[PDB]
Structure 1
Amino acid sequence: TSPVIGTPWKKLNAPVSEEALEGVDKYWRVANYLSIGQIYLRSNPLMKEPFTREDVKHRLVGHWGTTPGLNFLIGHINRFIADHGQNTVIIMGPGHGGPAGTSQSYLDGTYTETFPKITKDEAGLQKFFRQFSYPGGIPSHFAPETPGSIHEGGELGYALSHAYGAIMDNPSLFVPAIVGDGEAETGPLATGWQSNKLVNPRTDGIVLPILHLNGYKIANPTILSRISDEELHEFFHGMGYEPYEFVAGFDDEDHMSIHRRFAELWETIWDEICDIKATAQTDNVHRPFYPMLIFRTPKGWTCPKYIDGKKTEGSWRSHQVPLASARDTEAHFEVLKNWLESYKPEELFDANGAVKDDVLAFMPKGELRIGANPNANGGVIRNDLKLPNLEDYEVKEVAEYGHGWGQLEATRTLGAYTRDIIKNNPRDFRIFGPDETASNRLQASYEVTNKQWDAGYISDEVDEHMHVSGQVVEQLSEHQMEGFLEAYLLTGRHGIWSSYESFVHVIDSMLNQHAKWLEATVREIPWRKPIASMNLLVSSHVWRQDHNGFSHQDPGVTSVLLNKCFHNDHVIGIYFATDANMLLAIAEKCYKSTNKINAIIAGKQPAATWLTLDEARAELEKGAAAWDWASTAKNNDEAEVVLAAAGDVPTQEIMAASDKLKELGVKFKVVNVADLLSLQSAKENDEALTDEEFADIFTADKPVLFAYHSYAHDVRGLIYDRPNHDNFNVHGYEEEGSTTTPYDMVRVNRIDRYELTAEALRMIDADKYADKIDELEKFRDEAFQFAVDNGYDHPDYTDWVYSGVN
C-alpha cells in the first residue's frame, strides 16, 4: 500500500522566512557550480591555482540549456518540502538536464549513501565531476542510477502521464511535473494535459504541472513561447487548469528579488492546492481547476550572455554546451573561468571542500528527501498480490469431455480471475485500456469496481459502471495508458493493461524505454528493488479482425519485443495462450513476476480448450511441450513429421490438420510452444531450453512444420543455431488480409488446415501423395468459393470438432 509520509496538505500560515531564501539562493549557486563542474571539469574541482586547461575535460558532453532553471525549481521545492513536510516526488520531463538531478542527489546527502566512494570533500567532488558522461561513469540524463528518479526523460512526452500515474490511488503524494516547452509539442504530452479528467482529488494525489517555458528547443524556438500570453492562459484554462505565471531573469532584477517573488507565488499555489484537497474530503463529485505554473526563464540562465559574438544565454545556442572547446583556445578557457567564478564558489565550500553547513540548513531530512522518498524507489513499497486459488477458474469440461471441447472465449477467464484479484487487492491493482476493456472481454471486473471518470455525467442509460473513483482507467490513448501503468508500477503498485495487437506499435518507443529502465536496473543498480511487471494483454489479434480489416492487422509486437533479449536480463516475456487454462497459468506466473514486460497474446474469439490446468502449468515451466494425446508416434523415431504451434489459431489449424493426417496413417508428433523465448539459443539464454531438451522435443532428422502467430522472420531469427533448424518450416503472418470470413484470413496466409496438411505431405513424399495434395489444393479454392457464394465459412471448416471430444 502507498504510505502516508509527513504531514500532507498543510498550509504554511506564515511568511516565508528570509533565512530560508538565503539558503535557497546559496543552494542555487552551488547547484549551478556543480552542474558546470560535471560538464567541464575533470580535475581541480575548487579551482585551486593553478587552474589550467589541464583541468578541463577533453570531450565536453552534456546539456546546460535547462539545468539552471531545473536547479532553481528544485531548490525552491526543497525549501517547500522542508517547510511543509510534504510527500513529494519530482518528475523531470526534460531529462537531459541530468546534472541538475545529480547535483540534487549530491547536495541532499543521498548520493553519498548510495555511492560511498563519492565522498563529500575535495576528492569526492573531483570524482563526482569526472564521472559525469564519462567512460566508466554515470549517464548524461536523469537515470535509474540517479536517486530520486522514476522517469528517465530521454525520450520526450511522458512526464505528465507518469505524474498522473504516480498519484493514482496515492492520496498523500505531491508531484511537481516539470515539462519542457519543446516537449510540450510532442503528441503524447499534448493529450497528457487532459488527464486531470481521470483522477479524483480525494482518492488520488495532486499533480502540479510546471511548464518550463524557456522558449527554445534544440536550434529552434517552441510554439508555446511564441504565441500570445492570452492564448496560452486561455489554452491552459480550457484544459481544466488555473494558469499561474512566473517570469524571471529577463532583466537585471536582483536574485533575492526573484527568490522572494517565487516564494510568494509558490505559497499562493500551495494554498489553492490545499483548498482543493480540503474541499475534496467533503465534495469529490465536481472537478476543480488545478493550478499549473508557467515558468518563463531564459535558456541557460546563468551562463555568459555572449560568446563569439553570438547570443548564448536566452537562446538555443546554450542547449548542449556553450564553450564547445574550452580546451582548445585560451579565450574560451578565460570565459569558462569567469563563468565558474561568477557563482563565488569560494564562499560555498569549506577548506576541505564540503558544501558549507549554512548552504544546506534549509534542506529536508530523512524520508522526506527526493532521493530518499520511497515512492521514487517503488520496489521497497511493493508487496505481493494476494492471489485467488487458480483451480477455482479452471475450465473443467476438458477434464471429462475431452480435449478440444467447447467454443469459449479465452479472455473471459482472465476477466474473472482479474476481478477476484481486484476484490482481494483494492487500491493496489488497476486495469488500463485504450477504450478496449469491454472489447477484450475483461468486463467481469465491473462486478467489483467501476471505471474512474471525472468529467461530466449526463445520464444512466449511457453511464453504467462509471464512478469518480475506480480501478479501471480507460482513455483512447495508448501513450496515456502505458505511462499511467508504468508510473503505477514504478511507485509500488500492480496492474494489467489490454490492447488490440495492431496498436501496441503505438507504444514501441515507450516499451523500449521501459526495457531500458529494466535492463539498466537488473545489470548495475542493486539498490533499486524489483518493481512489479508491466503486464500487457494483447488481444483482438490479427487472425480475427472481422469488423476492421487490414488496417487493424499487424502482429509486429513480437519483433520489437525480441530485440530486448540480451545478456541474461530476462526483462521480456512473450507468452501465447493456446486456450483459457494456459492463459490462467500464464497470468498467474506473470502476476507473480517482477522487473519484466510480459506480453500475453490471447484471443477474444470463441476457441476450443485443449489443456487442463495441471497440463498447462506443466507446459509452462518448460515453455514448449509435446502433446502426447495428439501424437500418433510413440517415440521420436516413428514420426514422419513434427507439427509445432504457438498461438490459438495456429494451434487450431495444427490440430485440424493432424486429424486429416491421422486418416492417411501419417505418424507425427505434436508440439506446443507457450513461451517464445524458450526457443532461444541455449548459450545466449540460460533460462531457455537446453540443446538436449530441444532435440528431444524436435526430432533431429525429421522435418518440423511450425505454425506461428506473428511473422515467420521472428521464429527463424531465434532458432538459427538450434539443432534441426534447417528442417523447420515456419508458417506465419504474411501481410495478407482484409475484412472477410475467418477461414479466408488463414487461407490467404498459407496457414489454414488444408495448406498445413499439404505442407506436411510434401515434407514426406510429394510423389506418393500427389493426388491427395492436389485434392487438398482444389478443396481450398472450393471452400473459398463457398464463402463467396454463401457469406460464411464451409461446414467442413465451421463444424469441425476434434476427434478427442467425448
Structure 2
Amino acid sequence: TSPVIGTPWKKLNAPVSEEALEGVDKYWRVANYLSIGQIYLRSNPLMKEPFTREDVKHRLVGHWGTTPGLNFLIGHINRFIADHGQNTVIIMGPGHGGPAGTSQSYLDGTYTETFPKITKDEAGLQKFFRQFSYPGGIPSHFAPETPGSIHEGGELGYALSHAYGAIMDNPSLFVPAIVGDGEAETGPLATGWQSNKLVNPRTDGIVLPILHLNGYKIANPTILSRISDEELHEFFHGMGYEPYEFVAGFDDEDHMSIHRRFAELWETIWDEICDIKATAQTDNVHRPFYPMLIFRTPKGWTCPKYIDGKKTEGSWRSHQVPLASARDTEAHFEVLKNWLESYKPEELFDANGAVKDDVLAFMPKGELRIGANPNANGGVIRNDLKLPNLEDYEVKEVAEYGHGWGQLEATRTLGAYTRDIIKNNPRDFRIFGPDETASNRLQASYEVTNKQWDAGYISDEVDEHMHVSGQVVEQLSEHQMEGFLEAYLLTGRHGIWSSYESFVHVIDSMLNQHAKWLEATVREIPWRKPIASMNLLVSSHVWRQDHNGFSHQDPGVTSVLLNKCFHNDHVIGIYFATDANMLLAIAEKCYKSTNKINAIIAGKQPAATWLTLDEARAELEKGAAAWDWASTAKNNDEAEVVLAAAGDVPTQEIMAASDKLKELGVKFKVVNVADLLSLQSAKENDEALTDEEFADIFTADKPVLFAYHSYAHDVRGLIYDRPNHDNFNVHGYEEEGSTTTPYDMVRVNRIDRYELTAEALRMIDADKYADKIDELEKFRDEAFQFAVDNGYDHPDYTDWVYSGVN
C-alpha cells in the first residue's frame, strides 16, 4: 500500500519567515534563468565574456509562456514542503512547461543524482542547457525522463483525473494539481472537477487544484479568464470547491510583496486543508468544500513587455518563445541578453557555476523532495499482489462433461476471482467502471467492498452497495475511469477497469499516452521502476450488441493497440478470452504483469466452456494452440482445412462449423488464438510464435479459415510475412448489424456457423460440395426468416451443443 511519508496535514502556527521568502524569490529567479538557458543557449551558460549570438541554439524549441508561473508555484510549494514535512506530488497540467520541471529537479539535486554527467557546476550547466529539446538530449515536456513527473501533460485534460487517482487510498498524500486555463476548456478536464464527489478525506489524500489562469492558450484568450469573476467563483463553488484567488504581476508591485502575499494565502489554504483532514478523523460522512486556487498572473510573466511593438508579457505571444530568433539579429540578441540579465545571475551562481547555498537553503531534503518522492516513482512502492489460488475458480465441468459444456457467463468467474484479490489486497487494488461494473458482471466484489460515493445518500431502497469509502469507483466518464486508474498504478497500486467494447474508443488517446509513457520507460528510463499493468476488461462486445444495435458495434480497440507494438517493448497485451478458464489464465497473467496495457476481451453472455484451466494455461503460454481433441485430422498432411478462431463468439461458430464438417466426413484441424500478438512477425516480436511453431499450428500449405473477433484487417496486417499467409481467409466484423438476434449478428458479418461451414467446403472443393454449399446458404436465409417470424433464433442455432459434450 502507500507509504505514510513525512508529518502530514500539519499547520505552521507561525508566519512564513522572511528568510524563506528570500529563498523563494531567488528560486524563482534562478529557475527562470535556467528555464531560459535550456530554451535559448547551447553554450556559455553564465554569459562569460564574450557572450555572443554563437551561444544561441540554432533552433528554438520549447515553451516560455506557462513556465515563469510554474516556477513561481514550484518555488512556493518547495518552501511549503520543507516547512511542513508534507508528502507532496505535483501534477504539472501544462506539461509543455518542461523547463520548470527539469529546473526543479536540477535545483533540488535529484537531476545530478539521476543523471551523473549533468553536474552542479559550469560545465554541467552547459550540458543542462544544451540537452533540452535537442538532438540526443531530453524532451520538451515534463516527460517520464524527469525526476518528479507522473504526468507528461502533452495531451491536455487529464491533470485532475490523475491528481485524484494519485490520492486514492493515499491518506498522507497532498497533490497540488496545476491546471492550464486552456486545458480547463477540454472535455476530460471539465468533468475532472467533479472527482471530489468520489474521494473521501479520511481514507484518501487531498488534491488542491490550481487554475493557472494566465489568460491565454496558444493564440486565443481563455474562456475562464474572460468571464466575470463572479461567474468564475460561482462555477467552482458549484463543483464543491471553496475558491481562493491570487492576482499578481499586472502592476508594479515589487516581487517581495508578491511572495509575502502568496505565502500568506498559501498558508490560509493549507490551514483549511488541515482542518478538513482533522475533521475527517471524526466525521467523514459529510463532504467538505475543498479549497482551490485561482492563480491569475500574466502569461510569460517577467519576459520583456514588448518585443517589436507587440505585447508579449500577458499575451498568447509569449506561449512558445517570446523572442523568436535571438541568433539572427543583433537587436534580438540584445533583448535576449537583457532578459537573461534581469534575473541577475551574478547573485545566483558562484564562481564555479554552482547555484549558491542561500538560493536553495529553504528547499526540502530527502524523500520529501519533488523528484525523490516515491509516489512520483511508484514502481518503488509497488509489491506483487497476494493472489488467490486460481484452481478455486476453475470451471471444473469441462473435465466432468466434456469440452463445450455449459452456459456460463465467463466474466462472472473473473468477478469472483477479483473479489478475492480485493479481499486479500486491501487498499491496494481498485475497480473502476463507467457505471458498468454490475452490467459487465463484476459485482461479486460488492460482497467484500463498496462503491465509493461521497455525494448525497437518500435511501436504502436505491443506495445499495455504496459507502463513503470503498474499492470500486464509478462515474459515467471513460476519461475519469482510465485516468483514475492510470494514476493509481503510477503511484504503486493495482487494479482493473471494465468497459463496453465500443466505448473504449472514447479513451484511445489516453491509452496512447499511457503507452508512450511505458514505451519511453522500458526503452530508456531504468531508474523508473516497473508499475503494475493497466488492465482493461473489454466486455459486452460487438457480437452480443444486437440489443443496442449498429452504432454500438465497434470492436476497433484492437487496431489501436496494435500500433503500440514495436521494438520489443512488450507494453501491450491483447487477449481473447475463449471461455471462463481462459479468462482466469489471462487475468492471472495480467495481474502479475508490470509495465503493460492489457486488453482482455471477454464475453459476458452465456457461452460454452471449451478448455480446462490446465489446457488454458498451455494455450496462453504460446499464445495460440491446436485443439487436437477437436481436430479430425491427425497430423498436418491429412488436414484439408484449418479452422482457427480468436474470441468466444468466433470460437462458438467455428466449433459449430467443425461439427457440421465432421458430419460430412471432412478432415480438418481446429486452432484457437488466445493472444493476438503471438501471430506478429517473429522478427518484429521475440515473444511471438517462431515461424516453425507457426507452421506447425497453422500448416505449411493448407487453407486456413480464420474467424476473428474484430476487423479482419488486424489479422491480415499482422501475418503479412508468416508462412502460408496467402492461404488465410480471415472473417471478422465487417460493419454490419442492427438491433437483432445473436444469430443475425454473426450471419450479416459472414461468420455464422453455416457460412463458415460453406466457406470451408469452397476452400476444400467448391465443386464436389456444391449441393451441400447451396443447402447451407439456403438455411442461412431460413434461420433469418425464423427469427423475423417468431422473435428468437432458430432451434438449430440456439440448442446446439458440441458433440464432445457427454
Deviations 1:566-604 (A, max 9, x none): 000000000000000000000001000000000000000
Q: Report how far residue 387 of structure 1 moved.
A: 0.5
In structure 1, C-alpha distance between the alignment counterparts of 2:741 and 2:339, rounded to whole Å: 71
- In structure 2, what is the Cα distance between the partners aligned to 1:802 and 1:27? 73
Structure 1 residue 271, shift from structure 2 partner: 0.3
- Distance in 2, matches of 1:394 and 1:82, equals 53
Secondary structure (helix, strand or coil) at the match of 2:710 reads: strand
- Taking the aligned partners of 2:617 and 2:711, their CA distance within structure 1 comes to 27
Q: Is the 8 A contact 2:395 2:580 kept in 1?
A: yes
CA distance in structure 2 between the aligned counterparts of 1:61 and 1:389, rounded to whole angstroms = 53
Structure 1 CA distance, aligned partners of 2:282 and 2:322?
Answer: 53
Deviations 1:480-506 (A, max 9, x none): 000000000000000000000000000
Q: Is the 8 A contact 2:273 2:290 kept in 1?
A: yes
Cα distance in 2 for partners of 1:546, 1:459 equals 35
By how many angstroms is 1:430 displaced?
A: 0.2
Give me the whole-angstrom Cα distance separating, in 2, the residues matched to 1:570 and 1:794.
44
Distance 2:598 2:177 in 1: 28
The CA deviation string for residues 621-669 of structure 1, in whole angstroms up to 9 with x for no partner, is: 0000000110001110001000000000000000000000001110000
1:323 Cα deviation from its structure 2 partner:
1.4
Q: Displacement, 1:319? A: 0.2
Question: Offset at 1:546?
Answer: 3.2
Tell me the SS of whatever aligns to 1:531. Answer: coil
Partners of 2:546 and 2:737 within 8 A in 1: no
CA distance in structure 1 between the partners assigned to 2:553 and 2:468 by the alignment: 35
Deviations 1:92-112 (A, max 9, x none): 000000000000000000000
Q: Distance in 2 between matches of 1:289 and 1:323?
A: 42
Alignment correspondent of 2:293? 293
Partner secondary structure for residue 654 of structure 2: helix
User: Distance in 2 between the 1:240 and 1:189 partners?
Assistant: 15
Which segment is superposed worse, 695-704 or 447-456?
A: 695-704
Show CA shifts across 1:327-377 (max 9, x none).
010000000000000000011000000000000000000010000000000
DSSP 3-state at the match of 2:502 = coil
Distance in 2 (CA, whole Å) between partners of 1:361 and 1:397 is: 69
Q: TM-score, normalised by structure 2?
A: 1.00
Cα distance in 2 for partners of 1:191, 1:772 equals 57
Counterparts of 1:545 and 1:670 in 2: how far apart (Å)? 27
SS of the residue corresponding to residue 546 of structure 2 reads coil
The structural deviation recorded for 1:451 is 0.2
Equivalent residue, structure 2, for 1:772: 772
Q: Once the two structures are superposed, what CA deviation does each residue of 1:511-531 show, in whole Å capped at 9, x if it has no partner?
A: 000000000000000000000
Q: Secondary structure at the match of 2:43?
A: coil
Q: Displacement, 1:400?
A: 1.0
Which secondary structure state, in structure 2, belongs to the residue aligned with residue 169 of structure 1? coil
1:708 aligned residue:
708
Distance in 1, Cα, partners of 2:699 & 2:353: 69
The CA distance in 2 between the partners of 1:537 and 1:419, in whole Å, is: 15
List per-residue Cα deviations over 1:718-740 (Å, max 9, x = no partner).
00000000000000000001110
CA–CA distance in 2 between the matches of 1:359 and 1:325?
31
Indicate the RMSD between aligned Cα atoms, in angstroms.
Answer: 0.4
1:4-43 CA distance string (max 9 Å, x none): 1110000000010000001100110000000000000000
Aligned-partner Cα distance in 2 for 1:195–1:547: 32
| 1:55, distance to aligned residue in structure 2 (A) | 0.4
2:270 and 2:647 map into 1 onto residues whose CA distance is 53
Which consecutive unaligned segments of at least 5 residues does structure 2 have? none
For residues 403 and 498 of structure 1, what CA distance do their matches in structure 2 show? 28
Partners of 2:93 and 2:158 within 8 A in 1: yes
2:563 & 2:41 partners in 1: Cα distance?
A: 37
Deviations 1:430-481 (A, max 9, x none): 0000000000000000000000000000000000000000000000000000
Q: Distance in 1 between matches of 2:420 and 2:305?
A: 62
Task: Give the deviation of 1:699 after TM superposition.
Answer: 1.2
User: Which whole-Å deviations, capped at 9, do the CAs of 1:296-348 have from their partners, x for residues lacking one?
Assistant: 00000010000010001100000001111100100000000000000000110
Look up the SS of the partner of 1:672 in the other structure. strand
CA distance in 1, matches of 2:692, 2:257: 74
- How far apart are residue 547 of structure 1 and its match? 2.5
| Native 8 Å contact 2:546 2:745 kept in 1 | no
**Secondary structure of 2:3's match?**
coil
| Partner Cα distance (2:688, 2:210) in 1 | 46
Scaled by the length of structure 1, the TM-score of the pair is: 1.00
Q: Which residue of 1 aligns with 2:235?
A: 235
CA–CA separation in structure 2 for the residues paired with 1:742 and 1:45: 69
Q: CA shift at 1:251, angstroms?
A: 0.3
Q: 2:801 matched to which residue of 1?
A: 801
Deviations 1:761-793 (A, max 9, x none): 000111101000000001100110011000100
Distance across 1 between alignment mates of 2:34 and 2:721: 51
Aligned pairs (5 A) from 1:146-185 = 146-185=146-185
**Alignment map for 1:630-669 (pairs within 5 Å):** 630-669=630-669
Shift of 1:551: 1.6
Residue number in structure 2 paired with 1:29: 29
Cα separation, 2, equivalents of 1:783 and 1:466? 45
Conserved? CA contact 2:249–2:298, under 8 Å: yes
Aligned to 2:597: 597
Work out whether residues 641 and 764 of structure 2, in 8 Å CA contact, stay in contact via their aligned partners in 1: yes
SS in 1 for 2:302: coil
| Counterpart secondary structure, 1:692 | helix
Query: SS at 1:710's partner residue?
Result: coil
* Separation (CA, whole Å) in 1 of partners of 2:263 and 2:511: 39
Matched residues in 2 for 1:767 and 1:42: separation? 75
Shift of 1:383: 0.2
- Superposed CA offset, 1:378-411 (max 9, x none): 0000000001000000000110111110000000
Structure 1: how far apart are the matches of 2:663 and 2:613? Answer: 30
Runs of at least 5 residues in structure 1 that lack an aligned partner in the other structure? none
Paired residues for 1:325-336 under 5 Å? 325-336=325-336
Distance in structure 2 (CA, Å) of the matches to 1:423 and 1:119: 48
SS in 2 for 1:375: helix
Q: 1-side partners of 2:783 and 2:146: how far apart?
A: 62
Residues 81 and 368, structure 2, Cα contact 8 Å, conserved in 1: yes
Counting only pairs closer than 5 Å after superposition, residues 63-462 of structure 1 correspond to structure 2 as 63-462=63-462
Distance 1:579 1:131 in 2: 51
The aligned counterpart of 2:754 is 754
In structure 2, distance between residues paired with 1:60 and 1:602: 49
Partners of 2:795 and 2:145 lie apart in 1 by 61
Query: Alpha-carbon deviation of 1:701?
Result: 1.2
Shift in Å, 1:425: 0.5
- Deviation of the 1:700 alpha carbon: 1.0
Deviations 1:115-138 (A, max 9, x none): 000000000000000000000000
Residue 698 (structure 1) shift: 1.0
* 1:286 Cα deviation from its structure 2 partner: 0.5
> Residue 224 of structure 1: SS of its match in structure 2?
helix
Map Cα deviations across residues 75-96 of structure 1 (whole Å, 9 max, x no partner). Answer: 0000000000000000000000
Displacement of 1:617 in angstroms is: 0.2
SS of match in other structure, 1:352: coil
